[PDB]
């Protein structure tokens, strides 16, 4: 399984050629507190492309966990603000057997009853005021799913872009798989928010992938090891065109990563790779990266920071391509080399999905706002 988060059921039609889109994100509010006593989840969609695009060719697809999807009645969102375009509906896709699927669709391009201005190629675009509306309140849905099951299998989502001219194949790199936060998620609140550059980032995400053994970067510097690796892609969506070199305060910043405590003894080497969001032909394949550091994590049993690590540099641009002065996104890649094959690891462990986090902090360990991402890797219960 080479799918993001090891997700077992999803569309895997293949890939289009690399196009000039660079970001697509789904950002739902946490399912906490009073949200549970209602029947809605609020969200926004972020999108960015680097060269003018047009037409109904480009279709955004949103997959939701089957356990939620069974109770979804309607999903709507506003297009990017501009010329008074109207609120959009995400249309549910059905199968050939008279059943709904857990995938919804809306056009990418605003002029084609979609979300994002085709001619705008600068700052990240927002489709605001998204609402998923359910048949029942979320407390009733959570009860039916079962608290135990919500603990062991996180509620997933996947957003991605397909191209009709390419037989609905996926635009590579323009996919994000995450999970809905709930009241069992507390780590984000262990972090104090920095006052430095607090309006420079819009969103952070972490995508995960199991990569095969013995693959490498083009230059040979980076690699996955004999048992493969779990790859964490920490992606930062900018608000405008941040330059670290010119504008960062509270320097030097730290790149931070946290891996599920259960996996720590099964991770050996940890590599940091520099990755680039290309203006043309966006490509973040493993081969494209370059190894920039050997990393550590906290391995002392019982330590408050168990499974966490961080790295800095007196010039952090040596480790991270910040796409300085550009609105393009940033990808920080962590390669977690496994000590044995994943199936042996799981056998030794024998359900709870594995959780990973990443964020940037200032020199005083305070979170750079909107740079925290969390992601998961699926484990069959």
CA nearest to 318, candidates 332, 329, 308: 332
Least separation in angstroms between residue 145's CB and Ca ion is: 13
- Residue 149: CB atoms within 10 A of its CB come to 14
Point out which span in 125-133, 187-195, 299-307, 347-355 binds Ca ion (CB under 5 A): 347-355
Q: Which one, 23 or 353, has the nearer CB to Ca ion?
A: 353
Least separation in angstroms between residue 149's CB and Ca ion is: 9
Give the bridge partners for 42, in sequence order.
131
Q: Does 66 bind Ca ion (CB under 5 A)?
A: no
List, in sequence order, every beta strand (DSSP E) within the chain: 21-28, 40-49, 58-64, 72-77, 88-89, 91-94, 100-107, 125-134, 156-163, 169-179, 201-211, 229-238, 254-259, 267-274, 290-294, 308-311, 330-338, 354-361, 373-377
Q: Does 144 bind Ca ion (CB under 5 A)?
A: no
Q: Does 149 bind Ca ion (CB under 5 A)?
A: no
Least separation in angstroms between residue 142's CB and Ca ion is: 16
Q: Which one, 44 or 353, has the nearer CB to Ca ion?
A: 353
- Residue 351 assigned as binding residue: yes
Give the bridge partners for 14, in sequence order.
none
Least separation in angstroms between residue 178's CB and Ca ion is: 15
In Å, how far are 49, 52, 356, 367 from 23, measured between CA atoms?
7, 14, 21, 22
- Mark 352-381 with x for binding to Ca ion (rule: CB under 5 A) and - for no binding: -x-------------------------x-x
Q: Does 153 bind Ca ion (CB under 5 A)?
A: yes
- Residue 152 assigned as binding residue: yes
Least separation in angstroms between residue 259's CB and Ca ion is: 16
The secondary structure element, H or E, covering residue 139 is helix 138-145
- Residue 163 assigned as binding residue: no
Q: Which one, 285 or 346, has the nearer CB to Ca ion?
A: 346
Point out which span in 50-58, 83-91, 196-204, 344-352 binds Ca ion (CB under 5 A): 344-352
CA nearest to 331, candidates 232, 265, 246, 242: 232
Cβ(169)–Cβ(16) below 8 Å: yes
Annotated binding site for Ca(2+): 152, 351, 353, 379, 381
């Amino acid at each position: 399984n080479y799918s993001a988060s090891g997700n077992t059921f999803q569309e895997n039609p293949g890939y289009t050629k690399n196009y000039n889109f660079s970001d697509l994100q789904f950002n739902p509010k946490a399912i906490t507190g009073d949200v549970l006593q209602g029947n809605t989840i609020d969200f926004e969609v972020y999108g960015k492309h680097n060269i003018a695009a047009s037409t109904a060719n480009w279709e955004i697809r949103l997959q939701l966990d089957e356990r939620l999807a069974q109770y979804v009645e309607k999903i709507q969102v506003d297009p990017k603000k501009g010329v008074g375009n109207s609120r959009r509906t995400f249309v549910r896709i059905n199968d050939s057997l008279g059943r709904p699927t857990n995938i919804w669709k809306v056009n990418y391009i605003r002029a084609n009853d979609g979300l994002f201005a085709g001619a705008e190629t600068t700052d990240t675009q927002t489709a605001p005021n998204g609402v998923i509306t359910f048949e029942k309140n979320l407390d009733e849905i959570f009860k039916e799913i079962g608290a135990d099951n919500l603990k062991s299998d996180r509620l997933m989502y996947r957003i991605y872009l397909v191209s009709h001219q390419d037989d609905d194949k996926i635009v590579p790199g323009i996919e994000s798989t995450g999970y809905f936060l709930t009241d069992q998620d507390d780590f984000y609140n262990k972090l104090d928010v920095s006052e430095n550059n607090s309006d420079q980032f819009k969103h952070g995400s972490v995508n995960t992938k199991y990569e095969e053994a013995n693959i490498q970067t083009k230059d040979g510097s980076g690699s996955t090891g004999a048992n493969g690796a779990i790859i964490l892609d920490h992606k930062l969506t900018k608000e405008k065109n941040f330059s670290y070199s010119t504008s960062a305060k509270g320097t030097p910043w730290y790149a931070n990563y946290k891996i599920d405590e259960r996996l720590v003894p099964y991770v050996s080497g940890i590599q940091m790779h520099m990755v680039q969001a290309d203006k043309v032909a966006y490509n973040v394949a493993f081969e494209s990266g370059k190894k920039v550091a050997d990393l550590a994590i906290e391995r002392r049993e019982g330590h408050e920071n168990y499974g966490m690590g961080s790295i800095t540099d007196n010039d952090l641009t040596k480790l991270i391509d910040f796409a300085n002065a550009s609105p393009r996104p940033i990808v920080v890649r962590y390669v977690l080399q496994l000590t044995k094959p994943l199936d042996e690891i799981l056998e030794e462990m024998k359900g709870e999905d594995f959780i990973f986090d990443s964020w940037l902090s200032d020199t005083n360990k305070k979170l750079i706002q909107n740079t925290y991402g969390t992601g998961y890797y699926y484990l069959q219960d």
